[PDB]
Amino acid sequence: VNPSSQLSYAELQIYGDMNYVDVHRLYTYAFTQHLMGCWNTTNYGGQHRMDDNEMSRPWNNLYPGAMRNLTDAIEATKDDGTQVNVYAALRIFRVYVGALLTDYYGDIPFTEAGPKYDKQEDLYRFFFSELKEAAGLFDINAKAITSDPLFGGNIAEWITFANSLRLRYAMRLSDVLPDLAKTEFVAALEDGVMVSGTDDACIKHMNVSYSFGQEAYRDIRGNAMAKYFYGNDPANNPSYLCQTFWEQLYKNNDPRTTRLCRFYIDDFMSISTGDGRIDVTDAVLATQAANPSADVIYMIAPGEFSWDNWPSYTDILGSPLATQIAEIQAAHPDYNPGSNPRWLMPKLAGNFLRSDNPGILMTYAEVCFLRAEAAVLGWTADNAKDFYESGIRAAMDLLATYYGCSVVTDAEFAAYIAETSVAFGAVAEQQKSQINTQAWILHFHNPAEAWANVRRADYPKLQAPNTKNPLIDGADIPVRLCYPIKEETYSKDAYQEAKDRVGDYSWHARLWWDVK
Ligand SMILES: [Cl-]
């Protein structure tokens, strides 16, 4: 098999594999409190409900998929001087996937993957030296990378990516190994990290038809995360925003509010096409703003289903919403806006439901936020405020560049950074809060990083669900995924050792880099 094709498979799996990405709908996005209300999200992550099969999704898909493909291709190219470019890229991507896996599970098989679990500390130490080494192996006098949805075989961009991952991993270790973290951070900057959006690491995905048939599960060409956001039952189980994320945007007059979020009446949509959704966003926002003490917009708290805070439509005389609802009722005489008024709860915008949405691995926006925080920590002479503002500007540019959202204007941006909550503070602790809150908005698109970074930074400060719905496996938001149960009866010693190193093993037991 062509080594570049194995690289491509591994790349496309990250957002392309239905069997993998459902972990984000069920758990990750609940834990990060970006999404809530969809049965699948609330029932699992929203109720702190352990399910072996669901928690094992990364393990059971990334190992026999990406990790196996990369390790096989590495074995095939390791002694071939003509193939050093694909060799180097494969080694870098193996680190990327390895880091995902340890950030889910902690100690993991890695060295002997495709035999004890490697310690998370040893893995992170290895990532730095491995990324340095691999980046130095690229050579103009060797064969091209012939298949590569990440960088199209652009060697310079691969080097920049490896350097930038080191920057991420350094900030991850900022609490647990401060001295090493600083050293590695400074080294990464010296080698050269992403300097603009041109250097973004985003997987190109293909426009494919929505399908949830058995054959679709084998296909990784399209963005499966976006497909799951749309759902196999769009008209009754869409992606509702969690209150936490909605309020961060809306209460701060974030210009991204109407880019990321919409209000849709979905009764008349085509399930197969996604056409025919009625967008009432502008009328809903205008009506709430004109009538602040009226109950217009309804929200879904962490741990709630969409039907827990059952809304009520109360027609407001002369309002833009009354006018639009009247237009809908003219076109659909039997339509009753009060019958299923969950359309008054914000949903993910259509821009984020497209199969050709990118698979975001790492962005220049994030590099800005990393450099801002490192300045706040005293690690560098970088201007924290400058990098903070550059990060926000880049995060807003991202929505227009990759998702076809309306460009956030200079006027809109200036108004946003003048907001009291957003304007960079003078106290380092607030500054850290601001940087990581902005990162959390950015990382909506990149759920694994959203969860890793919120666990590390502890900003935003997320409150565990407090609702009438029972929490099944503990009160606090989980801080890891459990090992597959089958590892007990397959890697008895390795599995048992890993749990023993933790102490009181559960999904409430912090990972090594997650310091209380
Ligand atoms: Cl389903």
From TrEMBL:
Keywords from the named record: Signal
Gene3D superfamilies for the chain: 1.25.40.390
SUPFAM superfamilies linked: TPR-like
UniProt KW Transcription regulation keyword: no
Keyword Signal in record: yes
Protein name: SusD
